Amino acid sequence: LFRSEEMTLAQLFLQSEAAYCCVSELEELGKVQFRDLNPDVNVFQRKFVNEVRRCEEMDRKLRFVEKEIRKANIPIMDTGENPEVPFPRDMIDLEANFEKIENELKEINTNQEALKRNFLELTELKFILRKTQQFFDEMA
Amino acid sequence: VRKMKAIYHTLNLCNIDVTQKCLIAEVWCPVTDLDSIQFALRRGTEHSGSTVPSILNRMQTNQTPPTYNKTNKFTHGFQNIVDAYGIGTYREINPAPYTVITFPFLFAVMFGDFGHGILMTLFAVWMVLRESRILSQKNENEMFSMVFSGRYIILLMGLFSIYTGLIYNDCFSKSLNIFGSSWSVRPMFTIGNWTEETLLGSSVLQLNPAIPGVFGGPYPFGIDPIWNIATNKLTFLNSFKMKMSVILGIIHMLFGVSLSLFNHIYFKKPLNIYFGFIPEIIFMSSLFGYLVILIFYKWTAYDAHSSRNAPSLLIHFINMFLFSYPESGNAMLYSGQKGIQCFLIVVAMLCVPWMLLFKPLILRHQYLRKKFDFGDTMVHQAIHTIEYCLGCISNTASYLRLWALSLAHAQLSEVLWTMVIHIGLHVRSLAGGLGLFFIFAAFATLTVAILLIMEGLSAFLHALRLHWVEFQNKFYTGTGFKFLPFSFEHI
Amino acid sequence: AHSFALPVIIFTTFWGLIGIAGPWFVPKGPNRGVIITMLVATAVCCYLFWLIAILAQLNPLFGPQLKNETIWYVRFL
Amino acid sequence: TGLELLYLGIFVAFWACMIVVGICYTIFDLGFRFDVAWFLTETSPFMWSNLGIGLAISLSVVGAAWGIYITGSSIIGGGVKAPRIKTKNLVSIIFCEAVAIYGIIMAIVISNMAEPFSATDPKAIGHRNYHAGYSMFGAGLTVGLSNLFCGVCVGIVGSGAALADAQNPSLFVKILIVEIFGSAIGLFGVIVAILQTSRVKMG
Amino acid sequence: NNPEYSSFFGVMGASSAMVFSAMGAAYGTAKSGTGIAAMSVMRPELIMKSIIPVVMAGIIAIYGLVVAVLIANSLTDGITLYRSFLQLGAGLSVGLSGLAAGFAIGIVGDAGVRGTAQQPRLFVGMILILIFAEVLGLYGLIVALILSTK
Amino acid sequence: CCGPKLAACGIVLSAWGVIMLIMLGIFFNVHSAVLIEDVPFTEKDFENGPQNIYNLYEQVSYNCFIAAGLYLLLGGFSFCQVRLNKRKE
């Protein structure tokens, strides 16, 4: 009601491995801004840079798969239990393996597309041949 | 992967200590949710570790808090229209909830045509009744998304448009006669010797007769329908709308400035309260409340048979009392008015700008006696003072805008009626009504297109501008970071 | 020719009730601030608009031009 | 550039014809025929008054339009990379629009002093009327031209400041003074427009 | 005493009120159509999203038409030469106001159409600027209406 | 095609029409002095008396009722079409 809603700041103590679980739980709760404390990072001092790189690679793989699916005109209906659970570190490897199998299928599809390009060149040759069947009248 | 990326981004923002394996993260959380935050630690102390607490850090250096005050139900739509500026500045925020109705977004009609208000209310009510399936189903277009976000404001603005049409007594530019109409003609002509104009009035005095004899008495609710079916409608409506303009704008801007007094007493600062805003209110009152009181006095202290020598003179005193009125004037010079005018000019124009000066230097002297950049402080104060003193007049003039929309909408409705419906209703009933379906459908399409939406959108944004230039640019100033929790916005 | 004391009294009474009727709190549940501000603002604004219109209609300095050419028609009314 | 050539040709031809007809009139001892007094007298003051009103509002509105478009194009161009400027800069736009307002209210005041005549001859009937008509036409021209020119200046300055805001957002407050100076210059124009028609009787 | 050629001024007042507003609306429509055609080559879904500058030009033309219709309906044979100059002044004022409003509408509508093709978040802000254009033309209309009586 | 948008527009326009022409017909039956300019007038009726004015008022009112009648007719037709389209699936 009143337009004050005092915010105030706080410190969040953590642990080594407990930090991931606590942060995931808070993200599920989602009531904190987490103002940055280290400005001199520039990604180079991001500590978990490799995890961010893995996330970026997974995002690129997902984007490519989604673009291929949209080209295939396939719905993305995923209603139901959407926020299942924050991803644990160990299962990330299995998810990446499944995505790699999907990428292998996509690579097979790309090879098929190259073969289709060759077949389309053959079809263009066939059309030029169809024209040559009528050019015999022009030869006279 | 989005959750993992957010977690690792936060960890990057978080800091790592060398004394232990623990991590310290600065957290912006509400006071009410603090317990829930502890509950998160309760999850931490249960499965993964046991030493993950959280402690309120109550310091004063920086720590500019986010707003996070935008916590409300459907009425949050109002906030979005206010959220075009990003209030911030902690608890100073005093935006929509104080205004809501008296805001320039519910008097955002000034076009109430009874029927137009009922149409807007019907559309918004049907849409609110269907909001369940509307949100359940896919969106149509971004404009539809904006209308869906605004449905509540649309409906309540429709109600206020209905009320404004009722008080204006202009239903589709055609007035409504309820519980009498005042005025008459037989008393005006028989007593006034203007009789024997049955056909002579249709031959000699075309559009001539306009005289009040033994008459008077206003409509108990609104404006008499006789003013609508007359031809001096333009002049009387113009004067009435301009005077309503002045009174409404002055009271609105007065309320806007008055809110700043509470805004500042909350944030201590007695020097500004006793030196910066008292001059503003004093000047604003002495220059505009006088005009309002003069308008009311002119309205009340005269009668039909009281015009000075000339028959009507309309008003003749609204504008000749300008913002300076150097000398002479003559006309209306009721005793004491010259003295009151001179006193108001000297207290307002000569004194208020002069005392609005100084400010922190007054403390600086004491500071200089104890053992701040004077230049920037005084130049910023000077620019703010000139901006406000010119902006009082500028916003008083700019408050006149919505009334132009009012007049234009009234004329558009009247001309549309007289050009389509007046043509559609005539003699030879069979021929006059066989095609009435097409003409009336054209009427419906035109009323929807140019009046309901086009002019409706014009007023919709006009009133928002009146909000954001003078209404709310009086009590709250500044910007601040909005809320930003981990809501998993990615579905 | 309409009386003015009775309409102004009745409308002032009604708008005053709806304005100062918030101390009589119906919900006393949720926020309750937006609703009281809404009621007070609506009452004050509507009363101000109605009073402005009726005061403008009071004391008609100049009479309307009944230029309909149907003065003989309105004479019956 | 053909339009410019046509306009210059019309200008030079008309001015050459005017100077040659003036020299012919003064050479041929035919000065009495070239009567400016008869032109300013037999001409109806109503045309002067109404033309003054129309110009007073029209120049104001078209100068405001010049300003608003010359600043809106700048805003939309410079707001692609920084959407936040799409609304915050609007404080420099309303000026131009408010400048147009300085016309309509003005256009009322002069129009507040218009009366019919019911007279045709110019001898001793219309002297004060002549002065009133000419004075109000002059005031209308003054307000219209000054308001248009201040509107275009304010729009130019607002576009400049808006493009300045695209890089550092902290200089808008330091730069707000120029456009309010322009608006004050428009206020001077409106003030003298008020004073010119302050004491004039029409009838 | 009715002077001759009195209706001439009112007739050209109505003609100018119609014609100048028509020209302004036409210019706005042309500029905004060019902008829409330029933008539609890459964002086909955003065609009906920003067709509104065309309807804004239509609104300006509507203002011109209503002022012209009112002036023409106020026209009589025996104009006292005091009403005719009033009608002419109102017509010229509203006509040039509509011309300027159409000018601004066209230019800003083209700019905003290109911007909303490039940046989707810029549309609503453009709205404000664009709407102000109509207001200017609107002023002509109102300054005509008061000029229709006094 | 009888699209849902077309059927909805027809239904809402028909409802709009029926309510407005019914209220026009009522206001003509009472012969309110506001729509007098709208009502057709001939100079030969000025001296005849209010009886002729009321007669032509009744005639234009009856015109309005029959107009609302075919408005109700086409609204019912649109309702039938939309109901058939809905029940087809």
PDB file of N, CA and C in Angstrom, chain B residues 62-109:
ATOM      1  N   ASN B  62      27.229   4.554  -0.240  1.00  0.00           N
ATOM      2  CA  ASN B  62      26.498   4.180  -1.450  1.00  0.00           C
ATOM      3  C   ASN B  62      25.217   3.418  -1.122  1.00  0.00           C
ATOM      4  N   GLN B  63      25.131   2.157  -1.545  1.00  0.00           N
ATOM      5  CA  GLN B  63      23.970   1.305  -1.288  1.00  0.00           C
ATOM      6  C   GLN B  63      22.675   1.983  -1.727  1.00  0.00           C
ATOM      7  N   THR B  64      22.691   2.532  -2.932  1.00  0.00           N
ATOM      8  CA  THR B  64      21.486   3.119  -3.499  1.00  0.00           C
ATOM      9  C   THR B  64      20.467   2.016  -3.746  1.00  0.00           C
ATOM     10  N   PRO B  65      19.397   1.924  -2.956  1.00  0.00           N
ATOM     11  CA  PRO B  65      18.512   0.769  -3.067  1.00  0.00           C
ATOM     12  C   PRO B  65      17.712   0.821  -4.355  1.00  0.00           C
ATOM     13  N   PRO B  66      17.352  -0.330  -4.913  1.00  0.00           N
ATOM     14  CA  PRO B  66      16.410  -0.342  -6.037  1.00  0.00           C
ATOM     15  C   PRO B  66      15.029   0.090  -5.569  1.00  0.00           C
ATOM     16  N   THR B  67      14.137   0.300  -6.534  1.00  0.00           N
ATOM     17  CA  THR B  67      12.808   0.770  -6.174  1.00  0.00           C
ATOM     18  C   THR B  67      12.036  -0.344  -5.480  1.00  0.00           C
ATOM     19  N   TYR B  68      11.743  -1.425  -6.201  1.00  0.00           N
ATOM     20  CA  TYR B  68      11.052  -2.606  -5.687  1.00  0.00           C
ATOM     21  C   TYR B  68       9.707  -2.283  -5.041  1.00  0.00           C
ATOM     22  N   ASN B  69       9.230  -1.043  -5.150  1.00  0.00           N
ATOM     23  CA  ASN B  69       7.953  -0.652  -4.569  1.00  0.00           C
ATOM     24  C   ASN B  69       6.773  -0.970  -5.473  1.00  0.00           C
ATOM     25  N   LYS B  70       7.023  -1.460  -6.682  1.00  0.00           N
ATOM     26  CA  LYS B  70       5.962  -1.690  -7.661  1.00  0.00           C
ATOM     27  C   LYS B  70       5.277  -3.032  -7.423  1.00  0.00           C
ATOM     28  N   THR B  71       4.846  -3.262  -6.187  1.00  0.00           N
ATOM     29  CA  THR B  71       4.227  -4.521  -5.779  1.00  0.00           C
ATOM     30  C   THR B  71       2.731  -4.277  -5.625  1.00  0.00           C
ATOM     31  N   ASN B  72       1.955  -4.717  -6.611  1.00  0.00           N
ATOM     32  CA  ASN B  72       0.514  -4.503  -6.589  1.00  0.00           C
ATOM     33  C   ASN B  72      -0.145  -5.417  -7.615  1.00  0.00           C
ATOM     34  N   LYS B  73      -1.465  -5.542  -7.486  1.00  0.00           N
ATOM     35  CA  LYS B  73      -2.304  -6.327  -8.383  1.00  0.00           C
ATOM     36  C   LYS B  73      -2.588  -5.540  -9.656  1.00  0.00           C
ATOM     37  N   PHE B  74      -3.630  -5.938 -10.395  1.00  0.00           N
ATOM     38  CA  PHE B  74      -3.994  -5.392 -11.705  1.00  0.00           C
ATOM     39  C   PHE B  74      -3.731  -3.895 -11.823  1.00  0.00           C
ATOM     40  N   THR B  75      -3.969  -3.151 -10.741  1.00  0.00           N
ATOM     41  CA  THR B  75      -3.648  -1.728 -10.673  1.00  0.00           C
ATOM     42  C   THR B  75      -2.197  -1.446 -11.050  1.00  0.00           C
ATOM     43  N   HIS B  76      -1.360  -2.490 -11.086  1.00  0.00           N
ATOM     44  CA  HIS B  76       0.025  -2.321 -11.513  1.00  0.00           C
ATOM     45  C   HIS B  76       0.110  -1.725 -12.909  1.00  0.00           C
ATOM     46  N   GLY B  77      -0.929  -1.915 -13.727  1.00  0.00           N
ATOM     47  CA  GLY B  77      -0.947  -1.275 -15.029  1.00  0.00           C
ATOM     48  C   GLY B  77      -0.759   0.223 -14.929  1.00  0.00           C
ATOM     49  N   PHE B  78      -1.446   0.855 -13.969  1.00  0.00           N
ATOM     50  CA  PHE B  78      -1.229   2.272 -13.700  1.00  0.00           C
ATOM     51  C   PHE B  78       0.255   2.557 -13.536  1.00  0.00           C
ATOM     52  N   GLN B  79       0.917   1.764 -12.691  1.00  0.00           N
ATOM     53  CA  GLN B  79       2.332   1.978 -12.417  1.00  0.00           C
ATOM     54  C   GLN B  79       3.151   1.951 -13.698  1.00  0.00           C
ATOM     55  N   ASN B  80       2.797   1.065 -14.635  1.00  0.00           N
ATOM     56  CA  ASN B  80       3.552   0.983 -15.880  1.00  0.00           C
ATOM     57  C   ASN B  80       3.529   2.312 -16.618  1.00  0.00           C
ATOM     58  N   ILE B  81       2.363   2.961 -16.664  1.00  0.00           N
ATOM     59  CA  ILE B  81       2.281   4.273 -17.297  1.00  0.00           C
ATOM     60  C   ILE B  81       3.123   5.284 -16.534  1.00  0.00           C
ATOM     61  N   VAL B  82       3.164   5.177 -15.206  1.00  0.00           N
ATOM     62  CA  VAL B  82       4.096   5.996 -14.441  1.00  0.00           C
ATOM     63  C   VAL B  82       5.525   5.507 -14.644  1.00  0.00           C
ATOM     64  N   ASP B  83       5.709   4.201 -14.860  1.00  0.00           N
ATOM     65  CA  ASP B  83       7.044   3.611 -14.981  1.00  0.00           C
ATOM     66  C   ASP B  83       7.774   4.026 -16.245  1.00  0.00           C
ATOM     67  N   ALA B  84       7.245   4.957 -17.038  1.00  0.00           N
ATOM     68  CA  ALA B  84       7.991   5.483 -18.173  1.00  0.00           C
ATOM     69  C   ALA B  84       9.157   6.363 -17.744  1.00  0.00           C
ATOM     70  N   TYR B  85       9.257   6.703 -16.457  1.00  0.00           N
ATOM     71  CA  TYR B  85      10.335   7.541 -15.958  1.00  0.00           C
ATOM     72  C   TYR B  85      11.260   6.859 -14.959  1.00  0.00           C
ATOM     73  N   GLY B  86      10.862   5.733 -14.365  1.00  0.00           N
ATOM     74  CA  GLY B  86      11.748   5.040 -13.449  1.00  0.00           C
ATOM     75  C   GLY B  86      12.038   5.834 -12.193  1.00  0.00           C
ATOM     76  N   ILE B  87      11.042   5.945 -11.308  1.00  0.00           N
ATOM     77  CA  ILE B  87      11.080   6.913 -10.208  1.00  0.00           C
ATOM     78  C   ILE B  87      12.362   6.769  -9.395  1.00  0.00           C
ATOM     79  N   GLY B  88      12.541   5.613  -8.761  1.00  0.00           N
ATOM     80  CA  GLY B  88      13.703   5.425  -7.918  1.00  0.00           C
ATOM     81  C   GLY B  88      13.691   6.340  -6.708  1.00  0.00           C
ATOM     82  N   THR B  89      14.896   6.735  -6.289  1.00  0.00           N
ATOM     83  CA  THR B  89      15.115   7.610  -5.131  1.00  0.00           C
ATOM     84  C   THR B  89      14.441   7.062  -3.873  1.00  0.00           C
ATOM     85  N   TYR B  90      14.494   5.741  -3.717  1.00  0.00           N
ATOM     86  CA  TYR B  90      14.133   5.035  -2.477  1.00  0.00           C
ATOM     87  C   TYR B  90      12.676   5.338  -2.129  1.00  0.00           C
ATOM     88  N   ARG B  91      12.355   5.674  -0.879  1.00  0.00           N
ATOM     89  CA  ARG B  91      10.979   5.773  -0.410  1.00  0.00           C
ATOM     90  C   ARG B  91      10.323   7.107  -0.735  1.00  0.00           C
ATOM     91  N   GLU B  92      11.044   8.030  -1.374  1.00  0.00           N
ATOM     92  CA  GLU B  92      10.447   9.294  -1.792  1.00  0.00           C
ATOM     93  C   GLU B  92       9.288   9.077  -2.758  1.00  0.00           C
ATOM     94  N   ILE B  93       9.265   7.929  -3.439  1.00  0.00           N
ATOM     95  CA  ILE B  93       8.333   7.673  -4.531  1.00  0.00           C
ATOM     96  C   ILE B  93       6.896   7.921  -4.089  1.00  0.00           C
ATOM     97  N   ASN B  94       6.192   8.762  -4.845  1.00  0.00           N
ATOM     98  CA  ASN B  94       4.786   9.077  -4.580  1.00  0.00           C
ATOM     99  C   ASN B  94       4.071   9.221  -5.913  1.00  0.00           C
ATOM    100  N   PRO B  95       3.783   8.106  -6.583  1.00  0.00           N
ATOM    101  CA  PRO B  95       3.342   8.182  -7.981  1.00  0.00           C
ATOM    102  C   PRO B  95       1.858   7.940  -8.191  1.00  0.00           C
ATOM    103  N   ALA B  96       1.556   6.812  -8.837  1.00  0.00           N
ATOM    104  CA  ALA B  96       0.179   6.472  -9.191  1.00  0.00           C
ATOM    105  C   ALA B  96      -0.765   6.371  -7.998  1.00  0.00           C
ATOM    106  N   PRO B  97      -0.448   5.631  -6.902  1.00  0.00           N
ATOM    107  CA  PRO B  97      -1.482   5.350  -5.894  1.00  0.00           C
ATOM    108  C   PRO B  97      -2.113   6.596  -5.299  1.00  0.00           C
ATOM    109  N   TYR B  98      -1.333   7.665  -5.137  1.00  0.00           N
ATOM    110  CA  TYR B  98      -1.919   8.930  -4.707  1.00  0.00           C
ATOM    111  C   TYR B  98      -2.867   9.485  -5.763  1.00  0.00           C
ATOM    112  N   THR B  99      -2.497   9.368  -7.038  1.00  0.00           N
ATOM    113  CA  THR B  99      -3.288   9.950  -8.117  1.00  0.00           C
ATOM    114  C   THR B  99      -4.421   9.033  -8.578  1.00  0.00           C
ATOM    115  N   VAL B 100      -4.072   7.874  -9.148  1.00  0.00           N
ATOM    116  CA  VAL B 100      -5.004   6.949  -9.799  1.00  0.00           C
ATOM    117  C   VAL B 100      -6.135   7.680 -10.509  1.00  0.00           C
ATOM    118  N   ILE B 101      -7.144   8.090  -9.742  1.00  0.00           N
ATOM    119  CA  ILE B 101      -8.353   8.660 -10.326  1.00  0.00           C
ATOM    120  C   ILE B 101      -8.142  10.126 -10.681  1.00  0.00           C
ATOM    121  N   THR B 102      -7.759  10.944  -9.698  1.00  0.00           N
ATOM    122  CA  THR B 102      -7.492  12.353  -9.970  1.00  0.00           C
ATOM    123  C   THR B 102      -6.281  12.549 -10.867  1.00  0.00           C
ATOM    124  N   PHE B 103      -5.630  11.461 -11.260  1.00  0.00           N
ATOM    125  CA  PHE B 103      -4.509  11.538 -12.172  1.00  0.00           C
ATOM    126  C   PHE B 103      -4.973  12.056 -13.528  1.00  0.00           C
ATOM    127  N   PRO B 104      -4.083  12.673 -14.296  1.00  0.00           N
ATOM    128  CA  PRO B 104      -4.403  12.924 -15.704  1.00  0.00           C
ATOM    129  C   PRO B 104      -4.384  11.629 -16.491  1.00  0.00           C
ATOM    130  N   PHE B 105      -5.046  10.597 -15.977  1.00  0.00           N
ATOM    131  CA  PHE B 105      -5.295   9.402 -16.760  1.00  0.00           C
ATOM    132  C   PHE B 105      -6.696   8.857 -16.551  1.00  0.00           C
ATOM    133  N   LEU B 106      -7.481   9.430 -15.640  1.00  0.00           N
ATOM    134  CA  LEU B 106      -8.902   9.133 -15.512  1.00  0.00           C
ATOM    135  C   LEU B 106      -9.794  10.315 -15.831  1.00  0.00           C
ATOM    136  N   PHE B 107      -9.300  11.533 -15.656  1.00  0.00           N
ATOM    137  CA  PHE B 107      -9.822  12.655 -16.411  1.00  0.00           C
ATOM    138  C   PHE B 107      -9.234  12.707 -17.803  1.00  0.00           C
ATOM    139  N   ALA B 108      -8.693  11.577 -18.258  1.00  0.00           N
ATOM    140  CA  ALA B 108      -8.205  11.428 -19.617  1.00  0.00           C
ATOM    141  C   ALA B 108      -9.351  11.094 -20.549  1.00  0.00           C
ATOM    142  N   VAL B 109     -10.449  11.838 -20.461  1.00  0.00           N
ATOM    143  CA  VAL B 109     -11.498  11.665 -21.454  1.00  0.00           C
ATOM    144  C   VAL B 109     -11.793  12.993 -22.149  1.00  0.00           C
TER     145      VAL B 109
END
